[PDB]
Every structure is written in structure tokens, then in C-alpha cells.
């Protein structure tokens, strides 16, 4: 039954920088993590945005439009957990 030990955090980032959100999750079985930004499922497809190991989401060449509410979802057949944080790009 999944539980988020450390969720993403509030940050101010510079434009053109690289930042991450991380979501450390425990449970059984190992909880898969997803990312939503402003209620919508983040597109790893856009090649700035990278789902890396140990539940990290990374965003390179930061843009003003990356400001928003990023949410971590940790999921198991049992259930899911939520933890969100706010990113401000300037």
C-alpha cells in the first residue's frame, strides 16, 4: 500500500536551466510513479522532458511555460498516492 516518503518540492528555477522533480515512494509491489503538470499527464515525448531512474522527472532548457503545479502519482494494484509542489520559472 503505497506511501510517498519524499514528494516533489517548491522551487524557483532559471530560464534555460535543468531542474528535476523527484518522488521517493515505498510500497509493495514497487510503486510506479507518474507525473501530471497542471492536471495533465506530462509528455516525456517532448525531448526536454525526461523520466529518469529512482522516480525523477527532469526538464532541460527550462521555459516560462514550465511554471505550474507538478503532481507525483505513485501507484500499485492496491492503491495510489499523491504529492504535489509548485515550480516557478523566471
Amino acid at each position, epitope marked *: 500500500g503505497p506511501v510517498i516518503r519524499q514528494g516533489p518540492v517548491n522551487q524557483t528555477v532559471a530560464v534555460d536551466g535543468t531542474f528535476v522533480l523527484s518522488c521517493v515512494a515505498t510500497g509493495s509491489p514497487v510503486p510506479t510513479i507518474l507525473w501530471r503538470k497542471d492536471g495533465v499527464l506530462v509528455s516525456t515525448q517532448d525531448s526536454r522532458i525526461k523520466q529518469l531512474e*529512482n522516480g525523477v522527472l527532469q526538464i*532541460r532548457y527550462a521555459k516560462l511555460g514550465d511554471t505550474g503545479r507538478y503532481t507525483c502519482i505513485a501507484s500499485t494494484p492496491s492503491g495510489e498516492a499523491t504529492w504535489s509542489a509548485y515550480i516557478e520559472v523566471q
Partner: antibody
Amino acid sequence: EVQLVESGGGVVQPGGSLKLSCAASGFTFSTYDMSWVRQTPDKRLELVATINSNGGSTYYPDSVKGRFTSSRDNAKNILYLQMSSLKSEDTAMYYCAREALLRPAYYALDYWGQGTSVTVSS
Amino acid sequence: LDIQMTQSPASLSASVGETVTITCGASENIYGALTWYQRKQGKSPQLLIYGAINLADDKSSRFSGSGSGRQYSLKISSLHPDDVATYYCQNVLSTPFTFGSGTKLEIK
């Protein structure tokens, strides 16, 4: 055979300008992000510029922001770094490096050029 | 605000055939977003490890990268004379993408 080849280094006065080149061949230059990294006499290293495939995104650390401009030319395969307001702490060997294509897609540089020497003062 | 990478030791001399560990510390948890480079004298660096644990393609398995969280290590097994170089770890989590100062590996 992949080749990266920096030119245009040399000695300049404090406050001066410089324009470095990097000729690339033996790979698809238009597919890759490139980096500019330097090496101070103390043997420390420091990433100073990154540029993306088509040249539409650039990043610079605080130490060189505003003074360093990076640009590319994907027709003739060259990478440039323009340096102005140059300071003594910019004396360094400058490398042209390629961004690897990986899984998971971490930032790593798989190929480096052999560098061009840059010195600042008197 | 910037993320420190510290490298232990500064330098060391050891003997052929030995195993030798170089450690890299981050002022914060960098989630294995860490890369290793080898620089021989008069040469540009070369990628050794990426993502903390993944070995580069045309590089000797004598090299192993390990670690998680704040603490990382590079082990060189059965020391060869061609391993003489400086080794540098780098934070590729968030910018600035700082390098550790590096570690000069010498043979006795």
C-alpha cells in the same frame, strides 16, 4: 570515425573578445546537442555552454552568462562560442563535446575534441 | 543553492594489479544523476560511467561505478599503467552541472 576540431584560440587582453570554432564530421551533426567545456590551469573543469540540435535552445552558467554566446551552423557542421568581456579566470583549455544519445537519457558527453588553448592578460 | 561535488582523495599512487576506490560526495541527494570522466595527460576527457552505474561502451570492465543518494564511488580493479589519469565526477541532476575537482591517479 568521429571528428571534433576546435580552432581560433590564442592570447587576448582582459576585456577582449574571441570566437571559437569546432569543425565536426563523421556523424550527423544536425541530430545532436553540443557542449562547450573548459579546463582551468588548476585542472578543474567547468561546463560553460550547451546548445540543442537545431540551435533553438541555449544554456549558460552564472560564471559566463551574458559574456558567452553559443551558436551552430548545421549546413557546414560547425559549433561556435563567442566570448566577449573576457577575464583572467577564463584562461582555459576549451573543448567541443557531443551529447551522447542514451537510455536512460542522462547528460553525458561521449566524444570530445582535443581542445584549443585560450589565455587572458598582458 | 548550487550543488557541491567533493572528491576524495585529491590524489593517490598505488601499484599495478591493485584495486583502488575513488569517492564522490554531493551536498545533496542527486539520485544517481552522476557521470564519470577520465582525462589522461595532454588529452581531452572521455566518458567512463553514466547515471552513476552504467559503464560506457568501449571502456574496460575493470572500471565499476556504484553508489546512491549523496555518496558515490568509482572502483578501478587490477590497476593498469594506462589508467594513469585524473578522474572527475559530475552532477547532471540540476544546473549548474558542477564537476568535482578531480582525482589524480598515479602508479608507483
